[PDB]
Amino acid sequence: HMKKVFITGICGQIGSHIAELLLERGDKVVGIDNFATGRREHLKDHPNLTFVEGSIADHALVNQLIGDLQPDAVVHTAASYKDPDDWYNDTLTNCVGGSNVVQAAKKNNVGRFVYFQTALCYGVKPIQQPVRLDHPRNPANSSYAISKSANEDYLEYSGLDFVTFRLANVVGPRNSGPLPIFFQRLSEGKKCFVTKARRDFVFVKDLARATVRAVDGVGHGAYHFSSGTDVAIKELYDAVVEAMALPSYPEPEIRELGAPSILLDPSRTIQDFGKIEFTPLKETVAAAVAYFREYG
Amino acid sequence: HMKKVFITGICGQIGSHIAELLLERGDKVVGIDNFATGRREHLKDHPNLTFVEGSIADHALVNQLIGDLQPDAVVHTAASYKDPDDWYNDTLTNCVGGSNVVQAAKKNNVGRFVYFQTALCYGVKPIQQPVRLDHPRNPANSSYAISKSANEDYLEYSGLDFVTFRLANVVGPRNVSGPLPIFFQRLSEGKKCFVTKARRDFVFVKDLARATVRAVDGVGHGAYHFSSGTDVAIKELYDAVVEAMALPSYPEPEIRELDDAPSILLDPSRTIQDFGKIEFTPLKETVAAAVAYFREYGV
Ligand SMILES: NC(=O)c1ccc[n+]([C@@H]2O[C@H](COP(=O)([O-])OP(=O)(O)OC[C@H]3O[C@@H](n4cnc5c(N)ncnc54)[C@H](O)[C@@H]3O)[C@@H](O)[C@H]2O)c1
Ligand SMILES: NC(=O)c1ccc[n+]([C@@H]2O[C@H](COP(=O)([O-])OP(=O)(O)OC[C@H]3O[C@@H](n4cnc5c(N)ncnc54)[C@H](O)[C@@H]3O)[C@@H](O)[C@H]2O)c1
């Protein structure tokens, strides 16, 4: 049967990709986005899609939309982050908007809630390697992590049946971060710093299809959505130059560290979501780069 | 001879008592209150006082008030809490409003920032007794604790020279929340009161206000448990109220059983280290002061 799904931040990387999967299998999708960072083009028209331009900080709007629709699931991807000095929109969107969305879902007995969270909730340098789901919380390292983490608090407090995907880095088409930086600089002929660190990168499309399973009732609570492996920043850079189809090899500026590696332990995710086949790094980066070429 | 101090929640229990201390010594005080819980009558007029009705959620107002004053210090007492289901105001006041206040202070190079935090940052049933300052943070037990602790996080993150007083319960005149105003009202209406079999810390607002002035003046850095390190049974608080009201006979309370800890002590050690050995006002004196306020101002 046709599910009803409310998606916040539906014109963003993660939300638009989820929206596409749901719409293609016949679900009814209602979405909200204010275009802080998302783009209208990310979300193609579909007869079962309703799009509302607005902010999740708008309490009456969020309640009206969820109240009317009575969704089977809320997928909450909306987040403010782009300017680290903009504490105002970070709190207004992630705290006021985030609790608005959580409480509306709880008020309307929404059966499933999917949230997305930064691994910065554990601090910038974890005390566990790999980081386990019981790593102490240390979110006061940025406006983004602090506010994102207060939104998670409200979700855990609400009593909703939820799934939170805690993520290192999500990359692909529609994506900020190292990928667009690398692409942008190499396009301008600029030399890139490549630090001697390993980090975890996850294709948005792997995450989108694990979300559909969460919408369908797979999983409860917080998970590390990770392969359990990490990649060197050099390997990421190399993948970007490879997809860019350069007459080059431009040797980067190797830069010493100033954590060396952040592995997220995926044991609970393997347990409940099964052994997932994660898209290979080159293919993930190829898709991200084809998107940059076409848009920016 | 005249510090400039900006107070948020200036018409509340804690803010107004701090304003009074600063004004009587010759300081210049500017304050803001939306009357979500406090009262205009809590803040008496004074030549060196400027009062502004408004919300700290208003980014432009906060930045204009602090921007125009260039305070030596910000005392941030404003908080939303009174309706546990009102997540919107809690996050708009505590998170948006609270981050506004912290960031405006930092942008304006404010030398000292004093904040007030709930010991619910630690959870409802702590795993240390006495609770130490390194106790794990478990704030996801109420809208109040979650949004207060986000505000605390921004303060820590800002780079400001701050003191946070972490508190159990603050009581005395102008206390509008918690058991004390409820005991007074129900006792004066002849209604049955409920006493839980639990022990909690209660601190006289005026002790806290005098420590805040020291903190404004440069005493302490970081987080502290503002506490004697003792606690009292709720039954003792109730009995102190009956005796302060001089009721002609003792009204037997209804005893509730205690999820939650039987007793929460906060370790005062770092407070003694940096603020010295504070003579805490005894409960009897604290409750008599509160009862005197409730008889004049009502609940
Ligand atoms: N590396 C990553 O991209 C990554 C890693 C960890 C966590 N996450 C989380 O995943 C979620 C989505 O991430 P993304 O990569 O798709 O980011 P994104 O910027 O592509 O999408 C977020 C969307 O939210 C919208 N939005 C912002 N404020 C809004 C508001 N007040 N009301 C309505 N819409 C608003 C934006 O315009 C944007 O479309 C976020 O919660 C983010 O914190 C992402
Ligand atoms: N009172 C306690 O037992 C206790 C215990 C732990 C922590 N604290 C903290 O101490 C601080 C002060 O507590 P109190 O006992 O003085 O409470 P209070 O309610 O008397 O004071 C809070 C004041 O802030 C004002 N306020 C609320 N939202 C505002 C907004 N958006 N803009 C401007 N003003 C606003 C209220 O009207 C009120 O006057 C609060 O931050 C509280 O969380 C108090």
Numbering used by the authors:
A (entry chain C): 0 to 174, 176 to 258, 262 to 299
B (entry chain B): 0 to 257, 260 to 300
From the study:
WbmF, WbmG and WbmH are all homologous to Pfam01370 (NAD-dependent epimerase/dehydratase family). The abrogation or reduction of O-antigen expression as a result of wbmF, wbmG or wbmH mutations implicates all three genes in the biosynthesis of this molecule, and is consistent with the hypothesis that these three adjacent SDR genes catalyse the UDP-d-ManNAc3NAcA to UDP-l-GalNAc3NAcA conversion, which is probably required for O-antigen synthesis.
The C terminus of His6-WbmG consists of a loop that stretches out from the C-terminal domain to interact with the Rossmann domain. In His6-WbmH, this loop is not visible in the density, although this difference may not reflect any distinction between the real structures of the two proteins in solution. His6-WbmG and His6-WbmH copurify with this compound from the E. coli expression host, but in order to stabilise the protein in solution His6-WbmF required the addition of exogenous cofactor, and this is the most likely source of this molecule in these His6-WbmF structures. The preference in each case for NAD cofactor as opposed to NADP is indicated by the close interaction (2.7 Å hydrogen bonds) of an aspartate side chain with the 2′-hydroxyl of the adenylic ribose. Although we were unable to obtain any complex of WbmH with a substrate analogue bound, the nucleotide-binding domain of WbmH is conserved in sequence and structure with WbmG, implying identical specificity and a common binding mode for the nucleoside portion of their substrates. The active sites of WbmG and WbmH are devoid of amino acid side chains capable of acid–base chemistry except for their respective TYK triads and, in WbmH, Ser176. Structural analysis of these three wbm SDR gene products also enables us to distinguish between them in terms of potential catalytic chemistry. Both WbmG and WbmH have the conserved SDR catalytic triad (TYK in these cases), which suggests that they should be competent to function as oxidoreductases. The hydroxyl of Ser176 in WbmH may be capable of facilitating proton exchange; however, an amino acid pair capable of acid–base chemistry is required for 3,5-epimerase function.
